[PDB]
């Protein structure tokens, strides 16, 4: 199910990285992926307001959320 979105989160966009996100516990490694894509200048969508040019972005679905049909 997770394997789903990521793949077509590849196309749109090859934007990547992200960091290991150790938080406070615990650094055994923890690094997913990020997607800057490119956007329209309005964001009533996504808690990550980061409209600036484009969302960066923490989660794959938002790319699609900002994606064209």
């Amino acid at each position: 199910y997770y394997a789903a979105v990521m793949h077509y989160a590849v196309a749109h966009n090859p934007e990547v990285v992200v960091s290991e996100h150790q938080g406070v516990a615990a650094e055994q490694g923890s690094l997913y992926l990020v997607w800057n894509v490119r956007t329209e200048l309005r964001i009533p969508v996504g808690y990550n307001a980061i409209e600036g040019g484009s969302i960066r972005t923490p989660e794959p679905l938002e790319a699609i959320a900002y994606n064209k049909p």
Binding site: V10, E15, E20, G29, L33
Partner: protein, 416 residues
């Protein structure tokens, strides 16, 4: 299908938020900012559809296909995973190939009577099959499969000698596999990768030698057929092992990959000389599609110590010995978007313009034809049931489905 809020998806489909793929919850929704970029490219291909029959058939035995079958049934079967199944197979292989007294009895069921192998004369009174029943009398498998394959082995070495007489055929269906997922499945794939050579060494080498010892024309052979067969078969079992641990080898190569992926410090783990780009692992640098394996790797487990690390190794051999290159499985392999090339997409929506309705989906089948059958069985044993379609209904019911494909044009249906 279901629905969820976008801003609140972590409060909604919280597991689905990928941050969940990591143990992250926190005050914080993962993320932040950092470093090293490379689109992770070239994903393993499309195992969906492509259903078809395959033939076990000949005793000439292709380990490769059989492996594919093992993963196949394994996911499809009554016993996960492939791993334990391979263990059980090795057990059976001991109980059979490494258990010589059986073979005496087998030759006994073949030409066996007295003063074997009844000099130079032929006489191969056997269906392949009858052997199979005799072995069925022996140790049962929950999952015979290989129980056929062992017979196939009996054929392969008895093929040079006049016992090609039985030759019938054996058939089995596929089974659809997903995206495809979990690294444990990869573990299955790597132990199966061993099976490729855990098995073939007995599937091969074998003997062209002895016809049947020749000794013109060849040959007398008491237990000597069973002798030469099994003792070599056991010997073949010895060279087989695969040595290298299943979960370990993937754990390590995944370790080197993920820490290669690391923007935060690689530290002692690092890109290096022959530590990396060994004319293949760099191709994995290009195969970074198997990302997520690192994700659950820390999640399913935790620290990914390379433990059999070494530094020459590996490098050296182990990444070389990675599964996809040994190509079992619906492990599949491909460039980028073709796996995505079955993704629907409809922004729909308006004025805002972005949000209230943006759907996705997939294009799909309706080859209407569907079939049914009697389960004829020439002899009781398991489920080797012959079946013939029942066209008289089978066609018309399919015909009944014919408009229905024009109905529910799912793409058009999305428009709804």
């Amino acid at each position: 299908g279901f629905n969820l809020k976008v801003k609140d998806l972590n409060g909604s489909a919280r597991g689905l938020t990928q941050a969940f793929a990591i143990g992250e919850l926190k005050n914080q929704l993962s993320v932040g900012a950092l470093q090293l970029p490379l689109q992770f490219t070239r994903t393993f291909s499309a195992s969906m559809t492509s259903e078809l029959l395959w033939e076990v058939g000949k005793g000439n035995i292709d380990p490769v296909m059989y492996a594919r079958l093992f993963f196949q049934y394994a996911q499809a079967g009554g016993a996960l995973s492939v791993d334990e199944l391979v263990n059980q197979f090795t057990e059976y292989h001991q109980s059979t190939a490494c258990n010589p007294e059986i073979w005496r009895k087998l030759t006994a069921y073949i030409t066996g009577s007295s003063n074997r192998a009844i000099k130079a004369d032929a006489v191969g009174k056997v269906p392949p099959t009858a052997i199979l029943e005799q072995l069925r009398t022996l140790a049962p498998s929950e999952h015979e499969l290989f129980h056929h394959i062992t017979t196939d082995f009996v054929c392969h070495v008895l093929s040079p000698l006049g016992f090609i007489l039985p030759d019938a055929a054996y058939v089995y269906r596929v089974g659809r596999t997903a995206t495809y997922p979990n690294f444990y499945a990869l573990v299955d794939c790597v132990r199966a990768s061993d099976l490729r050579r855990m098995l073939t060494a007995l599937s091969s080498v074998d003997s062209k030698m002895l016809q049947a010892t020749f000794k013109a024309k060849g040959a007398l052979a008491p237990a000597l057929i069973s002798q030469h067969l099994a003792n070599a078969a056991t010997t073949a079992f010895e060279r087989s092992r695969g040595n290298f641990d299943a979960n370990a080898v993937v754990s390590s190569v995944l370790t080197i990959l993920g820490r290669l992926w690391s923007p935060s410090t690689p530290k002692e783990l690092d890109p290096s000389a022959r530590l990396r780009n060994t004319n293949g692992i760099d191709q994995l640098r290009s195969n970074l599609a198997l990302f997520i394996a690192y994700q659950d790797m820390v999640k399913q487990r935790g620290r990914a110590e390379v433990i059999f690390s070494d530094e020459e190794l590996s490098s050296t051999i182990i990444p070389w010995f990675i599964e996809a290159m040994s190509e079992v499985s619906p492990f599949k392999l491909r460039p980028i978007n073709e796996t995505t090339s079955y993704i629907g997409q409809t922004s729909a929506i308006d004025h805002m313009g972005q949000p209230s309705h943006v759907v996705v989906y997939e294009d799909w089948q309706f080859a209407k034809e569907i079939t049914a059958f009697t389960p004829v069985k020439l002899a009781n044993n398991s489920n080797q049931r012959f079946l013939d379609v029942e066209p008289g209904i089978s066609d018309r019911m399919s015909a009944t489905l014919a408009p229905i494909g024009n109905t529910f044009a799912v793409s058009a249906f999305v428009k709804n």
